Amino acid sequence: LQPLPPARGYIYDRNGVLLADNYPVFTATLSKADVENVDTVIEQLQPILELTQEDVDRFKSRIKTARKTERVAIKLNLTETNIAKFSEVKYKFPGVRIETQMTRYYPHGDLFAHVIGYVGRINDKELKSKDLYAGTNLIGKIGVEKSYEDLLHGTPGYEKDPTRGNDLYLSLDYGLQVVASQQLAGRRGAIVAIDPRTGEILALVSSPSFNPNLFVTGINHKDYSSLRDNIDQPLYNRAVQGVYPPGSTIKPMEAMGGLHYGIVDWATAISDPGYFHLPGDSHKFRDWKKTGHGIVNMHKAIIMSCDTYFYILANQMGIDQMNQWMRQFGFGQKTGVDLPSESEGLYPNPEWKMRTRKSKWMKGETISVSIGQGAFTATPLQLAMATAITANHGSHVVPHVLRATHGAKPFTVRNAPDGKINFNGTDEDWVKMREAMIDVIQSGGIRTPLYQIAGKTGTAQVKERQLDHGLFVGFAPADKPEIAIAVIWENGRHGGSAAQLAKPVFDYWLLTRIRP
Amino acid sequence: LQPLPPARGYIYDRNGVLLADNYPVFTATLNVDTVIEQLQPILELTQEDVDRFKSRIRVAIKLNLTETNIAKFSEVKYKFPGVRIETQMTRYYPHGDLFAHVIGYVGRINDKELKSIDKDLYAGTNLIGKIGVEKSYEDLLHGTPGYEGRKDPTRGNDLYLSLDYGLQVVASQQLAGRRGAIVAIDPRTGEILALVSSPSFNPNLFVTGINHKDYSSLRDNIDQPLYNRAVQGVYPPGSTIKPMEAMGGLHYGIVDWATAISDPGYFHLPGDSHKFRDWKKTGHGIVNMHKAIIMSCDTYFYILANQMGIDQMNQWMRQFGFGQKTGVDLPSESEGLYPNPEWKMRTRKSKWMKGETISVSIGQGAFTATPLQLAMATAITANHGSHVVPHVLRATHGAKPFTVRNAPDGKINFNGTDEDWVKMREAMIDVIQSGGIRTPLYQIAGKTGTAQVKERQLDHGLFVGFAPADKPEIAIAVIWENGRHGGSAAQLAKPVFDYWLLTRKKIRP
């Protein structure tokens, strides 16, 4: 009864464009039923196979637990020198076998590293959790490979045919991923593209990327330290882990809450003296334009990104109601994406402050939040979802990466919005807010003559590396949206700059539609 | 800066039928030991009402004061200065027994255990949601306070349940005097159209605090009117489970609609003497899938399970809602148990035996399901595999923002044709014609089952089904505790099907 381990499944894009693979290598096995006492044997072949002190520790861990009949890998994917140095002594080690196995390959490694992740060597912590993983050398460690490890893994067999792991079709588009990646080539930040009708992530780039293949068989302490100590942090996933102050990208949604709670009209106007002062308080809270913007109804506020209009709206609305509603767009909470280490962001409230800083909430801390400042931070993923919901007229979607799986194992794949934001407004309001956001593009310059983009821009302050971040959220075609994009250019200065990154993505998806 | 507490929101059915409201009452707010003896004849305080008030120790002496004790206290107002007379709201359930197990009740907020976890939000708030909808949606229902310059409080949100008053009445009658549950889901959305656990009880006894006499009636009643058989009760689902489990055969490629077996009336594990027994000792002869469903052969599913394996058996059945909470927006939802080697190793430290698989193969193992799970599994089956989440809330109206899910969760990838679902429907219609629930006006699909207990020793009868079969609008799970054979249970389901599908465009209160 020898275990026959199962083929890890392939991962494709939404088009069959192959993104993760299995190809054969030479690996040195060593079953317990073929050797008298392992610990000695390993010591002899350490210099001949160039085993590191980690490679022996790892091999011993499996052997102790492993069945007699199951072969345990001593060194994986042998280099041609390990092959040569062992073949000379091939017969002086009889129990040791050296035959063909599979490792994982990422044909387009940098491109999808931050969505697909990689597989690692299965280790100590993982070993304390079956007989499922008998012939299995590798486990998913981050990304899709982790979050969908069980679907991908397969089902073992014996000497009974093993059941091959499930194929995964991501909702990502090879082409759209390429375009967005180029947009952030040489630059730090993120670009997320969601289909608003579904919540499908059409493209997700955090930049710089890294090569996942370096991790599959174990990575050099030399190579790993270069990535971990790069100052641009290629290993950090800015789309699902990175968090940023959203700035005025939030104003369209926060305006919709004004309509929802009845605090404002589309015709409601304020006199904008260039500041807002809390009642019975002298500290002036300053518009970005210190002279002001004159009389400002909702539509001028969005077009011109007035802070003063939203200082007042927040003041009347209050942080509690401000929390309750903005959260409906995805803020302050994980989005639910089927990817491992997703960040919560922070939409601040007195409950968070009482535990974090044991101080009562100050009415002025609200004012900072209303313009996307203060403690308010969102992941690029969250910002894109908020823009998808705003594009789709309030239908709450879940950002997800998986489109279909094919295989023996049963699985349920989410492909429609879960529910609709109760909203005491017309549908017309969503349509008016779109038209406002079309004007953000027209009235201020990444215009296209082929379709209409709705969008809003923002700028965040850093916690050269000190330059403000540029943010841009938007969707197109505006009337009947198909894709919403959040871009965060780190140290990108003006937000409109970030819009420039977003246009080629839009253009590719809506107009332009393989090998490296 | 005195707080102004917020009006709790109203709860309706899906048609505006009012199911819970608040009405204004007079209550006497407030050493206390001397005054109460003087204030007892005036306010008609019982020895229980005084005990509560001393234990409770502004604190209420008596709630909902009659006009007379208000008049009789007004002449003596001066001998009691601290005693004040204020307005409060209490909660009323126009149809208490009918919707008790869906709406629950509000209790007194007295629970310091709950009165320490929350905020100054409940400032001036006397009532809190205790079980059911009132608990699960306490925050939506609660509202937002105000003060004294005065600030109007924001009232709680009105709730529209996906439940239908008429359909609830019909279903409730079916179990009048009987124990069990009936759940009706819309398979297109997962909306719960009806949910009755029987016996019921009157929730209004809880709003103001419940008497040890009244509470002891309910807690020590043998029928357990306080137990929610729909969302907490679990039963062995038995042969109701077969349509889904057969669909898993198709998905794993193990069987065809044409694949047939010889049923000698038993199944023999290879190299093993213990015979596994068909319900019909004669057998059923040659049995393809379609015969299997109509005649509820245990043998056909004994074989399929063995080939499928418990692990593969788990992956598939869990897609229908079994072994895990369904997600209903009601408080205490029970998981059920779809057993697996993981559960046995952790629970009883024993390796899984191939025969334990066989018990589960016909829904008679450690397998237990809630009527919720059964309704959901049948909804998905009617629905060709789109995973729905059973939910009770249809809309809310109010100031607080809320998101309401009212569409299917996702779609089971299924390595079959769409037609397999259509072939399985036709099988389940054939269950109705061939084996007295049939109607010529629409097509019912169904399957029957029987569970064994531990009159009240009679086996339970189960029935799952949906209609109209070709374009399903409603799926029902029925469980008569001690209803003998399922089929009795099916009888409870036909009036419900009929009210929804026929009568309901001609039952108001």
Q: Which residues from chain A sit within 8 angstroms of residue B399, using beta carbons? A: 261-262, 321, 424
B174: enclosing H helix or E strand: helix B165-174
Question: CA B308, CA B358: separation in Å to the nearest integer?
Answer: 11
Question: CA B232, CA B333: separation in Å to the nearest integer?
Answer: 5
Here the tokens at position A84 are 């040569």
Q: Phi/psi of residue A325, each to 5°? A: -85, -50
Helix A308-326 and helix A363-370, axial crossing angle in degrees, nearest 10: 90
CB B85 within 8 A of CB B65: yes
Sign of CA dihedral A363, A364, A367, A369: negative
Q: At B33, which amino acid appears?
A: D
Chain centre distance of CA B92: 21
**Number of residues that this document lists for chain B:** 509
DSSP category for residue A163: B
Terminal Cα-to-Cα distance of chain B (whole angstroms): 43
Asked if omega into A208 is within 30° of 0 (cis), the reply is: yes
A409–B251 CB contact, under 8 Å: no
CA-nearest of A338, A21, A9 to A155 is: A9
In a domain, B89, yes or no: no
In a domain, A339, yes or no: yes
- What CATH number corresponds to the domain at position A335? 3.40.710.10
**Mapped to the 3 state alphabet, what secondary structure does B198-237 carry?**
ECCCCCHHHHCCCCHHHHHHHHCCCCCCCCCCCCCCCECC
Distance from the B245 Cα atom to the nearest Cα atom in chain A, whole angstroms: 13
Burial degree of B85 (CB within 10 A; 0-12, 13-18, 19+)? middle
- Residue A18 CB coordination number (10 Å): 15
Q: Which residues contact B306 (CB under 8 A, 6 or more apart)?
A: B267, B269, B354, B357, B358, B361
Cα separation values, A253 from A257, A460, A487, A503, Å: 7, 18, 17, 22
List strand residue ranges (DSSP E) for A171-279, in order: 189-194, 201-207, 270-272, 275-277
Question: CA B195, CA B180: separation in Å to the nearest integer?
Answer: 11
Distance from the B409 Cα atom to the nearest Cα atom in chain A, whole angstroms: 6
In a domain, B36, yes or no: yes
DSSP category for residue B95: T
- Residue A435 CB coordination number (10 Å): 15
CB B184 within 8 A of CB B167: yes
What 3-state class would DSSP assign to A436? helix
B401–A320 CB contact, under 8 Å: no
Q: Which residues of B touch A (CB under 8 A)?
A: 144, 248, 251-253, 311, 315-316, 319, 387, 395-415
DSSP category for residue A139: E
CB A298 within 8 A of CB A268: yes
CB B108 within 8 A of CB B209: yes
Burial degree of B474 (CB within 10 A; 0-12, 13-18, 19+)? buried
Which one from B136, B172, B200, B239 is the annotated catalytic residue?
Answer: B239
Question: CA A313, CA A307: separation in Å to the nearest integer?
Answer: 10
**Number of residues that this document lists for chain A:** 516
CB A395 within 8 A of CB A328: no
Q: How many domains does chain A have?
A: 1
Calculate the CA dihedral of residues B90, B95, B97, B102 and round it to 10 degrees. Answer: -80
Q: Which residues contact A172 (CB under 8 A, 6 or more apart)?
A: A13, A14, A112, A115, A201, A202, A203, A204, A401
In a domain, A55, yes or no: no
A363: enclosing H helix or E strand: helix A363-370
CA-nearest of B311, B299, B301 to B352 is: B311
Question: CA A301, CA A305: separation in Å to the nearest integer?
Answer: 5
Domain boundary, last residue among B382, B401, B435: B435
A423–B402 CB contact, under 8 Å: no
Residue with tokens 């058989």: B229
Give Dmax (Cα) for chain B: 93
User: In Å, what resolution does this model reach?
Assistant: 3.3
Residue with tokens 């000695």: A40
CB A384 within 8 A of CB A473: yes
- Residue B176 CB coordination number (10 Å): 10
A411–B406 CB contact, under 8 Å: no
CB B434 within 8 A of CB B452: no
Q: At B2, which amino acid appears?
A: Q
* Annotation: binding site of A for Zn(2+): 272, 287, 293, 306
Burial degree of B352 (CB within 10 A; 0-12, 13-18, 19+)? middle
Question: CA B375, CA B358: separation in Å to the nearest integer?
Answer: 24
Q: At B314, which amino acid appears?
A: N
CA-nearest of A186, A180, A170, A185 to A116 is: A170
In a domain, B509, yes or no: no
Helix B418-434 and helix B371-382, axial crossing angle in degrees, nearest 10: 120
Question: CA A78, CA A73: separation in Å to the nearest integer?
Answer: 11
Instruction: Give the residue from A160, A325, A422 with the most B CB atoms within 10 Å of its CB, the best one to mutate.
Output: A422
B51 is in an annotated binding site: no
Question: CA A241, CA A337: separation in Å to the nearest integer?
Answer: 12
A395: enclosing H helix or E strand: strand A395-396
Question: CA A293, CA A305: separation in Å to the nearest integer?
Answer: 10
Cα separation values, B301 from B270, B286, B358, B374, B445, Å: 16, 14, 8, 19, 20
In a domain, B265, yes or no: yes
Residue A104: strand pairing partners? A22
Number of H helices, E strands in chain A: 18, 21
CB B33 within 8 A of CB B53: no
Among chain B residues, CA nearest to A421: B403
CB B320 within 8 A of CB B376: yes
Burial degree of A13 (CB within 10 A; 0-12, 13-18, 19+)? buried
Question: CA B17, CA B93: separation in Å to the nearest integer?
Answer: 12
Q: Which residues from chain A sit within 8 angstroms of residue B404, using beta carbons? A: 419-420, 422
B186 is in an annotated binding site: no
Sign of CA dihedral A131, A132, A135, A141: negative
Q: Which residues contact A503 (CB under 8 A, 6 or more apart)?
A: A446, A448, A453
In a domain, A269, yes or no: yes
Q: Which residues of A touch B (CB under 8 A)?
A: 155, 257, 260-262, 320-321, 324-325, 327-328, 396, 404-406, 408-424
Q: List chain B gaps (C–N > 2.5 A) by preceding residue.
A: 30, 57, 148, 435, 454, 506
Residue with tokens 């001393």: B54
Distance from the A447 Cα atom to the nearest Cα atom in chain B, whole angstroms: 34
Among chain A residues, CA nearest to B406: A419
Domain enclosing residue B346, as ranges = 238-435
Terminal Cα-to-Cα distance of chain A (whole angstroms): 44
In a domain, A15, yes or no: no
CA-nearest of B152, B94, B171, B205 to B499 is: B171
Question: CA B65, CA A26: separation in Å to the nearest integer?
Answer: 88
